[PDB]
């Protein structure tokens, strides 16, 4: 699950949303989703989940973005899917280049300590993946 404050970019409108607002309003936005071959596509959100308060850890990515997610949340890495809690400084996660919109890899600059936080989940049509804080994560 992703924490309150997580930014979700809609590739159709160009608007960046905070996940808690997408869930609370059940907003029918589109997000960027990664397909099997690693290409990125625009897909609509089809389910919204308010997962309550849970433990979340943080991953600071090259570029400044910090994604907070439960340690079990799966992240797409150079080595495939891996739980966020297993990642360490130096590991590379798949990301969406903000300028080109293409898939690339970014180094995790830092792992932040666990804390309690409101968490959410979004279901993305067909691809079951989504870009959050620029990082390709599991949906
Ligand atoms: Zn799914």
Swiss-Prot record:
It comes from the Bacteria. This is Endonuclease PI-MtuI. It comes from Mycobacterium tuberculosis (strain CDC 1551 / Oshkosh). The gene is recA. The chain holds residues 252 to 691 of 790 of the full protein.
């Amino acid at each position: 699950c992703l924490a309150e404050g997580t930014r979700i970019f809609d590739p159709v409108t160009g608007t960046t949303h905070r996940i808690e607002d997408v869930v609370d309003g059940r907003k029918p936005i589109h997000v960027v989703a990664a397909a099997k071959d690693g290409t990125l596509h625009a897909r609509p959100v089809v389910s919204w989940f308010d997962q309550g308060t849970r433990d979340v850890i943080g991953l600071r990515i090259a570029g400044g973005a910090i994604v907070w997610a439960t340690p079990d949340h799966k992240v797409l890495t150079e080595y495939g899917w891996r739980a966020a809690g297993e990642l360490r400084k130096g590991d590379r996660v798949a990301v969406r280049d903000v300028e080109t919109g293409e898939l690339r890899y970014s180094v995790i600059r830092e792992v932040l300590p666990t804390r309690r936080a409101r968490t959410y989940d979004l279901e993305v049509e067909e691809l079951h993946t989504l870009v959050a804080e620029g990082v390709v994560v599991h949906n």
